Amino acid sequence: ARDAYIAKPHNCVYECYNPKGSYCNDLCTENGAESGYCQILGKYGNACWCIQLPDNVPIRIPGKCH
DSSP: OEEEEBEETTTEEOOOSOTTTTHHHHHHHTTTOSEEEEEEEETTEEEEEEEEEOTTSOBOOSSOOO
């Protein structure tokens, strides 16, 4: 596993509104992630960051979203 932005339906980033909370963290673990946090230094703005995410879960890629 590794750390990165969690992908969503479809191929979209998970924008976090509560950076000072466990918003992204909880959502991250929801996909089998160990942890997560709101990332501000994102090329696409605020993206949900996940720590120790399994290669089984999709990540934010340079593609078009739904």
